[PDB]
Symmetry: C2
């Protein structure tokens, strides 16, 4: 008999709201926020130590018309000898609500958790950081993402301001991006040179490129071309798909929308770590 | 209006059977099987082109006591000009059944899909490969995994033998492993040297190491030590956790069970691509 997974996810609220779990993003994004807040280097990570299961059930699974769809708890222990340093809580917010309604629900939910985490006598009054995971819906190609964090100070109970997720973003091409991340800019330039094959004619590529902890996180590219049927557009999606694998960091989320005549005609997606990109047509 | 995700996952059968989705593994594992079967290099990947949604609903969501919990369809197009080369179908099998009951259900389900995929006139009679994703349950630390594949030949309908997933496995330490993967063996040796810090005394590490397409896939390690309380075991989990990050490939699943006195006392897990490992105690 081996110790059990102490962090379980509910699927009910996701069904009711047609929201993707996106577990990888929901877990990992929260780990990233932790490393922002302190030098996580040393700490040992444990899951779900202080919030009662019945309470999570209460707040997630027993609501007829839910907005909150999950709660995950990440507890970090560091040092005179290993004890608790901070708690991170990922609150999953449904695809149907706005970012503001997500924040509103966020405040409500967090007050209740602060209250409960403090009644647990094992808890050493460490800072608590709530982060909002804004979910995308089951028919959307985009992944859910973290949109705000708020923290409670050590030995306190009042929740801080909702704060932006540390993320620097860039436009491509831009002088700013080029000086900030030359070698990556060169990679995208190389990418663009691959699709040029679709008779040597240059094809302008536009992009938003965001970074978390200085490495490329997500790369959203757009191209606008003239529609010559599906056959042509297929050949182009293969040239582009391959070029994402050959030229772009595998640990980044890459998206390419192919537009024409005020329409998105195809989208290529290589998710955070995906062995191979997939194509969807309009 | 952007094209939609055409591959949606059901959560109902997973609820009923207390089974983890493990979406990353379920998708990516199937991509890996594809690359085994052909030089996927060129091909363009599209999702869910031939199986009707209503049929998936029928086979997954309408069964009172399900064994099959999802069906995903991956369609590969390659070349005189881009058309279909092969279909890959991942069948999700519940945590409660045995591998044999999974295969049994597998055969049943596949016959029905072969029948349906052939009625779709757009389908060019390409080979179809069914693979079984054997799910772990919601309270298990292990990830679901692919356990068998069976293929239907081009222009045919009869299902082939269930076949092992191409995966070479090794024991550590062993002479075999050392000659097959020296540099990786050195990495594990380095890992072991890190936990030696827990006063310079050697600690034997045992492992199973599996590979898919020649790179380390999963690394299951065991150590058996003497129990000196939780405080000591914590310090050791931090030394080990850090050592997984410092010394072991991030694109591998790493697990370390710490045993003592015929008991698994703690388990450290760094999932396929995890920013940081987590610890569970008995």
């Amino acid at each position: 008999n081996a110790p059990l997974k102490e962090q379980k996810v509910i699927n009910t609220a996701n069904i009711k709201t047609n929201s993707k779990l996106d577990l990888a993003e929901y877990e990992n994004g929260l780990i990233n926020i932790a490393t922002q807040q302190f030098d996580t280097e040393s700490h040992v990570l444990q899951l779900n130590q202080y919030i009662p299961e019945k309470l999570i059930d209460e707040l997630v699974a027993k609501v007829e018309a839910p907005v909150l769809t999950n709660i995950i708890e990440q507890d970090y222990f560091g040092k005179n000898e290993l004890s608790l340093s901070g708690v991170m809580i990922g609150l999953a917010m449904s695809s149907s609500v706005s970012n503001e309604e997500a924040m509103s629900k966020g405040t409500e939910v967090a007050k209740q958790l602060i209250e409960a985490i403090n009644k647990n006598d094992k808890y050493n009054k460490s800072p608590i950081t709530f982060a909002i995971f804004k979910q995308e819906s089951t028919s959307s190609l985009k992944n859910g993402t973290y949109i705000a964090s708020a923290t409670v100070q050590k030995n306190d109970t009042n929740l801080g301001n909702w704060s932006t997720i540390d993320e620097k973003s860039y436009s491509y091409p831009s002088d700013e991006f080029t000086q900030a991340h030359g070698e990556d800019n060169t990679k995208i330039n190389n990418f663009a040179k691959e699709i040029k094959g679709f008779n040597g004619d240059f094809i302008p590529v536009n992009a938003k490129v965001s970074y978390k902890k200085d490495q490329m996180d997500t790369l959203n590219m757009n191209i606008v071309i003239k529609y010559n049927g599906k056959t042509e557009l297929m050949a182009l999606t293969q040239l582009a798909a391959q070029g994402m694998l050959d030229k772009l960091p595998k640990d980044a989320k890459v998206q390419l929308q192919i537009k024409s005549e005020s329409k998105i005609e195809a989208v290529i997606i290589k998710e955070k770590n995906s062995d191979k990109p997939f194509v969807s047509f309009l």
